[PDB]
Ligand binder design. Structure first.
Ligand SMILES: Clc1snnc1CN1CCOCC1
Length: 284
């Protein structure tokens, strides 16, 4: 029975290696990674791989691994797929822990923009969770700890993390993680999966996919929002993505809205993430 070596980047940056039978469905490898992680609330999470165009794709747990990674290496990352709108409602602390690790990477990467003060407050919760109570013996007038807190570090930011870390004395790891989550969940780009597209006029937009629905970022003044209940049908054809908006009260007909994606694969990828968010956040 021929088995393939899988390599999985974990949220703490370490690399987990295992083997699955070469005809294995994605779920088999996902089960192995979740059991390694002692994670029971698996529904929020998934594995990503890079396609032949070097684009991040969700590994479909229901499909053969080989028919998705195709000609590519069996290298994956473990990631948050569905960001819970209210992480306080998750049943386990370890679930909230993995969600915190993902968000820290969202922040450092710049995918989750964040004000100076929120960067410092999130960092201060991370430090409290991992070091415990502020100790000055690990803090002088020039201290720059190993934690990555931001896409661009400054001494001012490092200073503010420590000022706030002093205020958290006696905070337990589960407690600091929950505070981290109560601030992060409020950020305007929390859990937003962004896709480059063009509107029906050719103007470059971003389509955001999140729990509350589909977001259309035209400019800073022009931001359309479509709540999931208002979307009856999501489709793609060629490089085009369409959503069928529900008829408003007393309106005779549905309206269709169309976008141009970079290529056919980008159109299919956005279609599949929309259906999955629509399904997930309809049931949650
Ligand atoms: Cl959604 C959302 S909010 N910030 N990032 C994302 C996209 N993730 C980030 C890494 O894992 C797979 C893709």
């Amino acid at each position: 029975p021929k088995s393939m070596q899988c390599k999985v980047i974990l949220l703490d940056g370490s690399e987990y290696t295992c083997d699955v039978e070469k005809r294995s469905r994605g779920q088999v490898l996902f089960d192995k990674v979740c059991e390694h992680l002692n994670l029971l609330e698996k529904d929020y999470f998934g594995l990503t791989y890079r396609d032949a165009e070097n684009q991040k794709n969700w590994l479909d747990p229901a499909k053969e691994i080989k028919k998705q990674v195709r000609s590519g290496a069996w290298h994956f990352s473990f990631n948050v797929k569905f960001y819970p709108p209210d992480p306080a409602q998750l049943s386990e602390d370890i679930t909230r822990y993995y969600l915190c690790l993902q968000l820290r990477d969202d922040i450092v990467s710049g995918r989750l923009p964040c004000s100076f003060v929120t960067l410092a407050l999130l960092g201060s919760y991370t430090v409290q969770s991992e070091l415990g109570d502020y100790d000055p013996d690990e803090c002088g007038s020039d201290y720059i700890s190993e934690f990555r807190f931001a896409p661009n570090h400054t001494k001012e930011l490092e200073d503010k993390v420590i000022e706030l870390h002093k205020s958290h004395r006696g905070m337990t790891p589960a407690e600091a993680e929950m505070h981290f989550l109560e601030n992060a969940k409020k950020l305007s780009m929390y859990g937003v999966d962004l896709h480059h597209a063009k509107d029906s006029e050719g103007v470059e937009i971003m389509l955001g996919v999140c729990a509350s629905g589909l977001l259309i970022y035209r400019d800073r003044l022009r931001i359309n929002r479509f709540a999931w209940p208002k979307v009856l049908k999501i489709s793609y054809k060629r490089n085009n993505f369409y959503i069928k908006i529900r008829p408003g009260e007393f309106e005779q007909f549905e309206s269709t809205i169309g976008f141009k994606l970079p290529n056919h694969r980008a159109a299919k990828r956005l279609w599949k993430v929309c259906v999955e968010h629509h399904t997930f956040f309809r049931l949650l």
